[PDB]
Amino acid sequence: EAIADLSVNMYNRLRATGEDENILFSPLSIALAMGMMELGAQGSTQKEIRHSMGYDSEEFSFLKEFYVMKIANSLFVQNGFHVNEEFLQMMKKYFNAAVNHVDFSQNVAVANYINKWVENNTNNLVKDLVSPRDFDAATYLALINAVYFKGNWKSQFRPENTRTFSFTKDDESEVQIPMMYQQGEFYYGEFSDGSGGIYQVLEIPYEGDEISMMLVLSRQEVPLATLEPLVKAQLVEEWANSVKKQKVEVYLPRFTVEQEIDLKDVLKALGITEIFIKDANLTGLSDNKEIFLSKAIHKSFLEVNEEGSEAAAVSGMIAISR
Amino acid sequence: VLYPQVIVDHPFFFLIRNRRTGTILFMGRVMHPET
């Protein structure tokens, strides 16, 4: 529910900084990563995270509570760097983090090693999360989360039904794209757009009956931006609770979306600032008071086609000594 | 009966969610769908 508000807050930042571009991220991945960071934080630094993530009202128990669906965490620790036993224990308990010892000074080697792990846990869909330019003698720790999903639509589109259609961008320009089609039994509702003053919500289940894709679409005459301010956690819940299974004529593009986001900017927008400064309190992760969070990275991939969807997101955290 | 038509031929918002728990896995928008 937390994740709910989190997702919407983070999305709003990305709208703000993402002038008219595609957006894609995984709030789940970001929460798991920040969960791991939080285990390291203390005092002021921990309190700020907890608040920003909405945990004031632990959260580790909820975080633990986690077709193909895979979630993996790993820790890369500088050789001979002494990490708090307690940190390590919790990290295993709550995140089942793989723990690896590396020499960050061997910067090409370590980048390759971390990138291989990413590939191994995203079906190769996310590449170059890190680079050798990320690592040196000052690097102490990297923590990574990956989320990976692959599912067939419960009711697949037949490739024979896919035809070229004009897609009208919100800047009124047009592109011709492959447009999948089926008449299927999906969950559908109509909501007032606040203004034919309605928008459509369509929920399409995947095989396995656990996961779905929800699509939200304004009337043709109206830009998506008109609907965006409406998007709040309470509304998301309402959408889920208001759609009715029925026959629907569905025209949906075959598409891929990718995004690398400035995760530091996003977290800062949530109010998370202390971890990023020299005098951060990460005394939870070790007795080494010189440590702070240098880089926060998030990259995602989504493919949508006739058979279903395949998606991955990875969040990475790189900690250094001043 | 006239079935609704959802014709995704302009920008849209999307979410991939756990139906049971409500957890949001992925979220975003497509402003530019072309290759």
Give the H/E segment covering residue A246: strand A244-253
Beta bridge partners of A318: A142, A295
Tokens of A77: 């620790």
Encoded tokens for A321: 């000594």
| DSSP-assigned beta bridge partners for residue A79 | none
Q: Is A286 helix (H, G, I), strand (E, B) or coil?
A: coil
Nearest of A265, A311, A4 to residue B26 by alpha carbon: A311
Contacts B26 to A, Cβ<8 Å: 24-26, 149, 300, 302, 311, 313
Q: Which of A249, A300, A305 best tests the B interface by mutation, with the highest count of B CBs <10 A? A: A249
Length of chain A: 322
> What's the CA gap between A224 and A217, in Å, rounded?
7
CB A188 within 8 A of CB A248: yes
Q: Among residues A151, A109, A157, A152, which one has the least CA distance to residue A134? A: A109
Considering only CB atoms, which chain A residues are within 8 Å of B32?
21-22, 169, 175
Rounded to a whole number, what is the distance in Å from the CA of A141 to chain B's nearest CA? 26
Q: Which residue has the tokens 């709910």?
A: A4
CB atoms A211 and B5 under 8 Å: no
Query: Quick check: A200 and A216 in contact, CB under 8 A?
Result: yes
Contact between A212 and B20 under an 8 Å Cβ cutoff? The reply is no
Give the C-alpha separation, A131 to A260, whole Å: 14
Contact B5, A190 (CB under 8 A): no
Q: Do A170 and B10 touch (CB under 8 A)?
A: yes
Sign, CA dihedral A52-A57-A59-A63, equals negative
Residue A175: burial class (beta carbons within 10 Å; 0-12, 13-18, 19+) = middle
Q: Angle CA(A110)–CA(A285)–CA(A127) in degrees, nearest 5?
A: 30
CATH of the domain at B29: 2.10.310.10
Q: Is B2 on the interface with A (CB under 8 A)?
A: no
Three-state DSSP class for residue A132: helix
Cα distances (angstroms) measured from residue A51 to each of A6, A59, A269, A272: 11, 12, 13, 9
- Number of neighbours of residue A317 by Cβ within 10 angstroms: 22
Pure H helices in chain A: 2-16, 27-40, 43-53, 59-64, 85-95, 107-120, 224-227, 233-242, 263-270
Distance of CA A217 to the CA centre of its chain: 22
Cα distances (Å, whole numbers) of residue A141 to A137, A156, A289: 11, 43, 14
Q: What residues have CB less than 8 Å from A274, skipping those under 6 apart?
A: A44, A45, A48, A280, A281
- Domain extent, residue B34, equals 1-35
Domains and CATH numbers, chain A: 1-155+255-322 (3.30.497.10), 156-254 (2.30.39.10)
Instruction: Pick the closest to residue B18 from A306, A4, A263, A242 (CA basis).
Output: A4
Report the alpha-carbon distance of residue A123 to residue A308 in Å, rounded: 16
User: Which of A320, A267, A268, A315 shows the shortest CA–CA distance to A292?
Assistant: A320
* Tokens matching residue A223: 């830009």
What is the resolution in angstroms? 1.8
Burial class (CB in 10 A: 0-12, 13-18, 19+), A173: exposed
β-bridge partners, A174? A168
The β-bridge relationship of strands A139-152 and A163-168 is: unpaired
Amino acid (1-letter code) at residue A283: T
Give phi and psi for A209, each to the nearest 5.
60, 20
Domains: count for chain B: 1
Tokens of A64: 């633990």
- Separation of CA A224 from chain center: 21
C-alpha atoms less than 13 angstroms from C-alpha of A183 in its C-beta half-sphere:
4
> Could A311 and B15 be called an inter-chain contact, meaning their C-beta atoms sit closer than 8 Å?
no
Distance from CA of B20 to the nearest CA of A (A): 7
As a whole number of angstroms, the distance between CA A226 and CA A240 comes to 20
Q: Is A201 left (phi over 0), alpha (psi -120 to 50) or beta?
A: beta
Residues linked to residue A183 through DSSP beta bridges, in sequence order: A249
Taking the C-alpha atoms of residue A62 and residue A50, their distance in angstroms, rounded to an integer, is: 14
- Dihedral of alpha carbons A140, A121, A131, A12, sign: negative
Dist. CA A319–CA A288, nearest whole Å: 12
DSSP secondary structure string for all residues of B1-35: ----EEE--S-EEEEEEETTT--EEEEEEES----
Of the candidates A240, A215, A63, A211, the residue with the CA atom closest to the CA atom of residue A150: A211
Q: Read off the tokens for A42.
A: 């203390």
Q: Are A315 and A126 in contact (CB under 8 A)?
A: no
